[PDB]
Amino acid sequence: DKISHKIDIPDSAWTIGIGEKFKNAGHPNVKYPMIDDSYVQGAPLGGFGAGTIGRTYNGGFSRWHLEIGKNKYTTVYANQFSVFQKVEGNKDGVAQVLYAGEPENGYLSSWKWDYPKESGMYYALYPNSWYTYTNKDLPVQLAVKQFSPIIPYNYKETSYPVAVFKWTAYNPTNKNVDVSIMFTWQNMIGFFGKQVNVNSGNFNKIIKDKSKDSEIVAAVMGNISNDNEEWNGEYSIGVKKVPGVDISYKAKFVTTGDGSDLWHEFSKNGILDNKDDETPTKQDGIGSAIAVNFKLQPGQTIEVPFALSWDLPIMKFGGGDKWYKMYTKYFGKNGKNSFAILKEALNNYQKWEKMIDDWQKPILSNKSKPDWYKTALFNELYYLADGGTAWENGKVGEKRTNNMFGLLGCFDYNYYETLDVRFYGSFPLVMLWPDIEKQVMRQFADTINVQDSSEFKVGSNGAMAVKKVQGMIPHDLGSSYALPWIKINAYDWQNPNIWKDLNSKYVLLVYRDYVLTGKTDKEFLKYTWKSVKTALDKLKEMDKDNDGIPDNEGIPDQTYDTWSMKGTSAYCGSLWLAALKAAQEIGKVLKDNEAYIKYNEWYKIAQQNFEKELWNGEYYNFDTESDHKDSIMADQLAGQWYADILRLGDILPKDHVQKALKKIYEFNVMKFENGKMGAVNGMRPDGIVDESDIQAQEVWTGVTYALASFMKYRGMTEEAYNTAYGVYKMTYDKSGKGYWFRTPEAWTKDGNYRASMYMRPLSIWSMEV
Ligand SMILES: OC[C@H]1O[C@@H](O[C@H]2[C@H](O)[C@@H](O)[C@H](O)O[C@@H]2CO)[C@H](O)[C@@H](O)[C@@H]1O
Ligand SMILES: [Ca+2]
């Protein structure tokens, strides 16, 4: 490996060998169908709300999130980079697709597949990833840096459906070598959203933009139809000319054929025919190819940028609504703008790289933090782009000031902005894209007094319940299979209108979003104030025994939605205490004296009774009425965790909080698989895991990262990082279970998982407050 010296990969990048087999991989631990796309994954390309494309560590474009809210894992084999090399003096050169695999059928059989093992590495530090190619049959060593412009406090480039592939080629040998790099792409119009005639009318055109010192050659892969539909739009690939490279292209090759129409050209001398051809296809799949060819002398390095864009302006949800995607604000809505997007990227990628470096640098340069923590902190952010992210710029047929946003809880449980989860998972948005965060919270504010009296069948018990109760915060803002932002509470496993955590979490999120954006946004507090008061007042009505605290009802009426709580729970009780303290402070800020007084009175009564009911001398009991009421819950003091972040002080005595955190580390962490797998949710006082429900026997990745941040704020530095380390290890390490770029909700002691690609572990960013 002589190429690594010519590029700048951070030491904290996650790494794996190209073509590496992973032996230890986990699988779903439930009986019902659950997504398991394998460990062959990578950092995604594409902006927020753009639709994303997962290019894996083996080189294939395989995890397709272009249909917003859906996950489709299938390798489109025509989509590749390939290399040609010929040493001066040799008769023939060699050509190789840079993909560690081959197609399942006979299509593209002429191409040289099966990039060999031990010949290159993949590296990821989101939003950047890299591949190096160090192959004994390729005298010129190559590397590529690929990324999308995901930039905190930037709501423009961050939305773009674009990726840059910045290639570096170096000749360490003592002979001249001719080199070509070729990007191939299938015209994917009709890949989704088209019920019939899936390739018909697809056609490819070549664009040559020859303006002084900025020559670009691109293929635009579209359809002859000007229809404005979810399926229609354009893909573009292309390259910018640099000194010492020549560009060649082929507008049209057949992807549903043996591929030799293209490969016979590339394999001969690395130069394509430059044949334009706009003839539309009928049944056959087609694709385009863009290549560069150059001669490298001994010791010479060259850099050349390629790009990919996709202009698919309309997203459709299963309930029938069609929306424009956010990036259409910047490029237009007609779906004929892929070249414009590509051109912006090719002309500005160096600036974008620097903007990314500028945001990563403060963390990466901090030599007090271990590399592994940096690996997890950046790579967990993959989910902000890969979580079915929807970001609208108008309904089709519709202008509003704001652009609604939604991130999925996960794909298996396909609900937008699951609030009991976003309490943990929204830290990166408040910290890095706060205008999105505040918009999402205003979305929730607007739903508080919505009433929907139609009934749904509750999954857990078969009972009928009202869809949405006035004054109760919704569980979620709908499903991609139905109507995001329009039909809320798509979740039906439990009835969220009787949940004891949602209303308190809502208030805590509101106050968090004020505190972590500088305590300046009075107007955000003004917008949300009525909903905050309503939420707490409604939750107070669920106090059955007048101890000042809502009563859990002996069912799973909160985020642990198979783990029943009864009476006063540590979890919902502490959240309630903190929400009351937050509402007191908002009342002071807004000069609402009567609110301050009321919530202060409620807080003092509840705080006294919480302490008396639950403090056992060593920790806070799980609850007051369950069979295993004395279980040690990892999340028992979630309200105090948020109170630290919100700077609300002690809601419980410092001494008792410290004892409880030490107990949790001693038991839930250290007595669960030697503390190498995170914090198990429930442990019995005898040091055996609580078996009352499956969720007690799970480590929740987002709960564990949040607990680590809590420990860190409380000065338990070693404990904090050791607790988080188990989550990192399981996700990323060779000794783990292969969950990189699909961090799950949970795993059990065997390492097998529930719900890959999950929002909650974004809570790692709470460690940076
Ligand atoms: O619906 C989301 C919800 O699913 C829960 O799993 C259920 C599943 O939905 C149901 O179809 C199956 O028959 O039973 C399981 C329970 O064992 C899951 O446990 C929840 O955490 C999740 O929110
Ligand atoms: Ca009560």
PDB file of N, CA and C in Angstrom, residues 58-100:
ATOM      1  N   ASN A  58     -17.831  -3.734  -0.685  1.00  0.00           N
ATOM      2  CA  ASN A  58     -17.407  -4.530  -1.848  1.00  0.00           C
ATOM      3  C   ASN A  58     -17.484  -3.767  -3.167  1.00  0.00           C
ATOM      4  N   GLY A  59     -18.026  -2.551  -3.143  1.00  0.00           N
ATOM      5  CA  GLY A  59     -18.058  -1.666  -4.317  1.00  0.00           C
ATOM      6  C   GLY A  59     -19.409  -1.558  -4.998  1.00  0.00           C
ATOM      7  N   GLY A  60     -20.354  -2.425  -4.660  1.00  0.00           N
ATOM      8  CA  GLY A  60     -21.658  -2.441  -5.329  1.00  0.00           C
ATOM      9  C   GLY A  60     -22.618  -1.403  -4.807  1.00  0.00           C
ATOM     10  N   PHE A  61     -23.441  -0.875  -5.708  1.00  0.00           N
ATOM     11  CA  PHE A  61     -24.513   0.038  -5.347  1.00  0.00           C
ATOM     12  C   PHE A  61     -25.726  -0.856  -5.051  1.00  0.00           C
ATOM     13  N   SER A  62     -25.986  -1.072  -3.762  1.00  0.00           N
ATOM     14  CA  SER A  62     -26.820  -2.189  -3.308  1.00  0.00           C
ATOM     15  C   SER A  62     -27.977  -1.852  -2.375  1.00  0.00           C
ATOM     16  N   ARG A  63     -27.851  -0.844  -1.521  1.00  0.00           N
ATOM     17  CA  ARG A  63     -28.942  -0.533  -0.592  1.00  0.00           C
ATOM     18  C   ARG A  63     -29.683   0.733  -1.037  1.00  0.00           C
ATOM     19  N   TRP A  64     -30.837   0.527  -1.673  1.00  0.00           N
ATOM     20  CA  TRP A  64     -31.542   1.591  -2.365  1.00  0.00           C
ATOM     21  C   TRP A  64     -32.639   2.159  -1.471  1.00  0.00           C
ATOM     22  N   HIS A  65     -32.507   3.438  -1.137  1.00  0.00           N
ATOM     23  CA  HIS A  65     -33.515   4.168  -0.368  1.00  0.00           C
ATOM     24  C   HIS A  65     -34.053   5.319  -1.224  1.00  0.00           C
ATOM     25  N   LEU A  66     -34.094   5.144  -2.539  1.00  0.00           N
ATOM     26  CA  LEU A  66     -34.589   6.194  -3.439  1.00  0.00           C
ATOM     27  C   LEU A  66     -36.093   6.366  -3.358  1.00  0.00           C
ATOM     28  N   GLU A  67     -36.809   5.283  -3.113  1.00  0.00           N
ATOM     29  CA  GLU A  67     -38.215   5.339  -2.786  1.00  0.00           C
ATOM     30  C   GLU A  67     -38.335   5.685  -1.289  1.00  0.00           C
ATOM     31  N   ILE A  68     -38.816   6.892  -0.994  1.00  0.00           N
ATOM     32  CA  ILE A  68     -38.668   7.467   0.344  1.00  0.00           C
ATOM     33  C   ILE A  68     -39.473   6.661   1.334  1.00  0.00           C
ATOM     34  N   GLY A  69     -38.801   6.158   2.361  1.00  0.00           N
ATOM     35  CA  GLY A  69     -39.443   5.327   3.364  1.00  0.00           C
ATOM     36  C   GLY A  69     -39.254   3.837   3.180  1.00  0.00           C
ATOM     37  N   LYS A  70     -38.686   3.426   2.036  1.00  0.00           N
ATOM     38  CA  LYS A  70     -38.498   2.013   1.711  1.00  0.00           C
ATOM     39  C   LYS A  70     -37.015   1.665   1.683  1.00  0.00           C
ATOM     40  N   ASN A  71     -36.734   0.404   1.989  1.00  0.00           N
ATOM     41  CA  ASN A  71     -35.400  -0.150   1.936  1.00  0.00           C
ATOM     42  C   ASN A  71     -35.395  -1.312   0.956  1.00  0.00           C
ATOM     43  N   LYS A  72     -34.640  -1.186  -0.130  1.00  0.00           N
ATOM     44  CA  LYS A  72     -34.580  -2.224  -1.151  1.00  0.00           C
ATOM     45  C   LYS A  72     -33.124  -2.610  -1.372  1.00  0.00           C
ATOM     46  N   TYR A  73     -32.754  -3.824  -0.958  1.00  0.00           N
ATOM     47  CA  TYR A  73     -31.373  -4.284  -1.041  1.00  0.00           C
ATOM     48  C   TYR A  73     -31.236  -5.186  -2.252  1.00  0.00           C
ATOM     49  N   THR A  74     -30.585  -4.668  -3.282  1.00  0.00           N
ATOM     50  CA  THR A  74     -30.321  -5.390  -4.504  1.00  0.00           C
ATOM     51  C   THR A  74     -29.180  -4.663  -5.248  1.00  0.00           C
ATOM     52  N   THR A  75     -28.195  -5.409  -5.724  1.00  0.00           N
ATOM     53  CA  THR A  75     -27.049  -4.830  -6.384  1.00  0.00           C
ATOM     54  C   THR A  75     -27.423  -4.629  -7.846  1.00  0.00           C
ATOM     55  N   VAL A  76     -27.292  -3.401  -8.318  1.00  0.00           N
ATOM     56  CA  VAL A  76     -27.518  -3.096  -9.715  1.00  0.00           C
ATOM     57  C   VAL A  76     -26.156  -3.267 -10.367  1.00  0.00           C
ATOM     58  N   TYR A  77     -25.936  -4.409 -11.022  1.00  0.00           N
ATOM     59  CA  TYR A  77     -24.568  -4.783 -11.402  1.00  0.00           C
ATOM     60  C   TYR A  77     -23.906  -3.857 -12.422  1.00  0.00           C
ATOM     61  N   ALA A  78     -24.690  -3.184 -13.266  1.00  0.00           N
ATOM     62  CA  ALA A  78     -24.129  -2.258 -14.242  1.00  0.00           C
ATOM     63  C   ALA A  78     -23.470  -1.027 -13.616  1.00  0.00           C
ATOM     64  N   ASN A  79     -23.772  -0.737 -12.355  1.00  0.00           N
ATOM     65  CA  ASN A  79     -23.297   0.476 -11.677  1.00  0.00           C
ATOM     66  C   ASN A  79     -21.956   0.195 -11.028  1.00  0.00           C
ATOM     67  N   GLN A  80     -20.867   0.652 -11.647  1.00  0.00           N
ATOM     68  CA  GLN A  80     -19.519   0.299 -11.176  1.00  0.00           C
ATOM     69  C   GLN A  80     -18.494   1.318 -11.580  1.00  0.00           C
ATOM     70  N   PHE A  81     -17.346   1.233 -10.924  1.00  0.00           N
ATOM     71  CA  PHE A  81     -16.114   1.761 -11.467  1.00  0.00           C
ATOM     72  C   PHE A  81     -15.269   0.563 -11.904  1.00  0.00           C
ATOM     73  N   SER A  82     -14.585   0.747 -13.026  1.00  0.00           N
ATOM     74  CA  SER A  82     -13.692  -0.263 -13.607  1.00  0.00           C
ATOM     75  C   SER A  82     -12.371   0.420 -13.959  1.00  0.00           C
ATOM     76  N   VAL A  83     -11.304  -0.377 -14.051  1.00  0.00           N
ATOM     77  CA  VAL A  83      -9.971   0.127 -14.337  1.00  0.00           C
ATOM     78  C   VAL A  83      -9.339  -0.671 -15.474  1.00  0.00           C
ATOM     79  N   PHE A  84      -8.585   0.031 -16.304  1.00  0.00           N
ATOM     80  CA  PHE A  84      -7.727  -0.547 -17.327  1.00  0.00           C
ATOM     81  C   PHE A  84      -6.322  -0.063 -17.045  1.00  0.00           C
ATOM     82  N   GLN A  85      -5.352  -0.977 -17.096  1.00  0.00           N
ATOM     83  CA  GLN A  85      -3.949  -0.604 -17.008  1.00  0.00           C
ATOM     84  C   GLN A  85      -3.111  -1.370 -18.028  1.00  0.00           C
ATOM     85  N   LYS A  86      -2.192  -0.662 -18.679  1.00  0.00           N
ATOM     86  CA  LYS A  86      -1.224  -1.288 -19.588  1.00  0.00           C
ATOM     87  C   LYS A  86       0.149  -0.696 -19.348  1.00  0.00           C
ATOM     88  N   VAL A  87       1.112  -1.557 -19.039  1.00  0.00           N
ATOM     89  CA  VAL A  87       2.493  -1.123 -18.849  1.00  0.00           C
ATOM     90  C   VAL A  87       3.116  -0.879 -20.229  1.00  0.00           C
ATOM     91  N   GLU A  88       3.819   0.235 -20.383  1.00  0.00           N
ATOM     92  CA  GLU A  88       4.525   0.501 -21.643  1.00  0.00           C
ATOM     93  C   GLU A  88       5.503  -0.644 -21.928  1.00  0.00           C
ATOM     94  N   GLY A  89       5.404  -1.228 -23.121  1.00  0.00           N
ATOM     95  CA  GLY A  89       6.242  -2.366 -23.515  1.00  0.00           C
ATOM     96  C   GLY A  89       5.517  -3.697 -23.549  1.00  0.00           C
ATOM     97  N   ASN A  90       4.382  -3.788 -22.861  1.00  0.00           N
ATOM     98  CA  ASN A  90       3.569  -4.993 -22.912  1.00  0.00           C
ATOM     99  C   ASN A  90       2.638  -4.978 -24.111  1.00  0.00           C
ATOM    100  N   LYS A  91       2.268  -6.180 -24.533  1.00  0.00           N
ATOM    101  CA  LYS A  91       1.391  -6.393 -25.672  1.00  0.00           C
ATOM    102  C   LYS A  91      -0.039  -5.979 -25.325  1.00  0.00           C
ATOM    103  N   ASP A  92      -0.508  -6.479 -24.184  1.00  0.00           N
ATOM    104  CA  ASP A  92      -1.874  -6.266 -23.712  1.00  0.00           C
ATOM    105  C   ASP A  92      -1.909  -5.590 -22.345  1.00  0.00           C
ATOM    106  N   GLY A  93      -3.043  -4.953 -22.065  1.00  0.00           N
ATOM    107  CA  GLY A  93      -3.336  -4.408 -20.743  1.00  0.00           C
ATOM    108  C   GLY A  93      -4.305  -5.338 -20.046  1.00  0.00           C
ATOM    109  N   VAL A  94      -4.708  -4.956 -18.834  1.00  0.00           N
ATOM    110  CA  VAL A  94      -5.689  -5.725 -18.073  1.00  0.00           C
ATOM    111  C   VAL A  94      -6.820  -4.786 -17.692  1.00  0.00           C
ATOM    112  N   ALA A  95      -8.025  -5.336 -17.598  1.00  0.00           N
ATOM    113  CA  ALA A  95      -9.203  -4.561 -17.219  1.00  0.00           C
ATOM    114  C   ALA A  95      -9.927  -5.312 -16.128  1.00  0.00           C
ATOM    115  N   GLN A  96     -10.496  -4.573 -15.180  1.00  0.00           N
ATOM    116  CA  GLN A  96     -11.078  -5.181 -13.991  1.00  0.00           C
ATOM    117  C   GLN A  96     -12.191  -4.302 -13.455  1.00  0.00           C
ATOM    118  N   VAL A  97     -13.366  -4.890 -13.225  1.00  0.00           N
ATOM    119  CA  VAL A  97     -14.439  -4.192 -12.488  1.00  0.00           C
ATOM    120  C   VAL A  97     -14.038  -4.143 -11.015  1.00  0.00           C
ATOM    121  N   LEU A  98     -14.192  -2.978 -10.388  1.00  0.00           N
ATOM    122  CA  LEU A  98     -13.846  -2.827  -8.973  1.00  0.00           C
ATOM    123  C   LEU A  98     -15.022  -3.208  -8.070  1.00  0.00           C
ATOM    124  N   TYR A  99     -15.391  -4.479  -8.152  1.00  0.00           N
ATOM    125  CA  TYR A  99     -16.480  -5.065  -7.393  1.00  0.00           C
ATOM    126  C   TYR A  99     -16.082  -6.480  -6.967  1.00  0.00           C
ATOM    127  N   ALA A 100     -16.111  -6.729  -5.664  1.00  0.00           N
ATOM    128  CA  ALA A 100     -15.734  -8.041  -5.109  1.00  0.00           C
ATOM    129  C   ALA A 100     -16.929  -8.983  -5.169  1.00  0.00           C
TER     130      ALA A 100
END
